[PDB]
């Protein structure tokens, strides 16, 4: 798989890049490279905004820029990703979808987001998806792109209901015991110890899960 | 002021937070970010912080003992004590707006089969404690979750409806033009147009801030 991240803040990307496991980069199944998109805007003052039309407050990014960058660096095989706060949910069975994608291109924008127009033309020679993390509000799309990054690049090979607590040694821990049921050698009463805990830890966090 | 510790096990993964939101912040000096290599808790000549989980199943269970140490020195009663979860109670806006006026936060960035439940139990008895998600999607590790939390916090520090399309110049590009509403100057038919649009995309893409069904 081959991962494009388009960005004004290209060392934002470069730790998740060296992060993967050279046995992977050496056999072909992953590379990740980051762009500046700097380098296709088409004035020395470097502008990759401008005001909305229609009014109101920040900048929206420029369609010509992101248009060069873009047509540069995508291609019909390509799934553009936009993050975006008014996107389509990023999920888990999204990101086992996107994992066996041959070429994924990034588009990392701001919060007031890119002119419409740059993913409407894309969508005429390529498939776009625009995808929110979650429901919160960050400034720019580079946070969303690491998590993206790391989703789904965990489900590329060589790369319901909640899970309960956990234990690990020591048994007695400030006051703190592990559960003895854990310790019993009876996997089906731990299995269903288990189920127990997952159920009420669901309806006390996610309820919005059952 | 805002005071922000992250400990993990991989320190460098957190540089993203520099030169950006949170780098600008930072340098302005409203919020102070620090973060801890876990390992320096570690006695171990291995500096070991995982081990077996009891009861069984996959993979390994960062130990209490080091985070406990960790967590002693670092926080206050005053901490509010953030841990990364996908089991965790949802992070959203709202939760955002209400971290924004912590005078100290220390996120603890577990790996995903997660992080002795002792640890979150034990520090629960002299601070505040909030295990949370910030989506239903598998990362590896809390870290790319903190980056997430911290730049949500950071933009709300002092110093419904999805957002609708947005253009800008030129009026015409590739043949498709902006919606002649936007150029009109009309403010009343703009914010009409732009009320609509915002009502097809949330029904379209997230009919459950609506009410409706997914
Ligand atoms: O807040 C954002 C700004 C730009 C791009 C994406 C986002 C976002 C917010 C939540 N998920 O994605
Ligand atoms: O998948 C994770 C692993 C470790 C810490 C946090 C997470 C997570 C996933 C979604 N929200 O948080």
Same mark, same amino acid.
């Given at each position: ?14 730790? !998740? ?7 992977? +980069? &050496?056999?072909?199944?992953? *590379?990740? #490279?980051?762009?500046?998109? @700097? ?65 994924? !291109? ?7 987001? +890119? &002119?419409?127009?740059?993913? *409407?033309? #894309?969508?005429?020679?390529? @498939? ?74 669901? +309806? ?7």
């Amino acid at each position: 798989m081959k991962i494009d991240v388009v960005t004004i803040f290209p060392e934002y990307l470069q730790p !998740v890049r060296q992060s993967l496991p050279g046995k992977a +980069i &050496d056999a072909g199944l992953v *590379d990740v #490279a980051v762009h500046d998109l @700097r380098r296709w805007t088409h004035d020395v003052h470097k502008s990759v905004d401008d005001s909305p039309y229609g009014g109101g407050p920040g900048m929206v990014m420029k369609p010509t820029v992101w248009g060069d960058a873009l047509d540069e660096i995508c291609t019909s095989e390509t799934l553009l990703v936009v993050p975006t706060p008014a996107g389509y949910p990023f999920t888990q069975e999204t990101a086992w979808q996107w994992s066996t994608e041959d070429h994924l !291109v990034i588009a990392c924008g701001r919060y007031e987001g +890119i &002119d419409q127009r740059v993913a *409407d033309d #894309a969508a005429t020679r390529m @498939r776009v998806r625009e995808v929110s993390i979650g429901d919160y509000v960050l400034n720019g799309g580079e946070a969303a792109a690491l998590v993206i990054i790391e989703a789904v690049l965990r489900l590329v090979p060589g790369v319901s209901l909640l899970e309960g607590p956990s234990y690990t040694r020591p048994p007695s821990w400030r006051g703190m015991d592990v559960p003895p049921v854990l310790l019993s050698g009876d996997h089906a009463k731990i299995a269903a110890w288990r189920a127990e805990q997952s159920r009420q830890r669901t +309806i006390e966090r996610r309820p919005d899960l059952l």
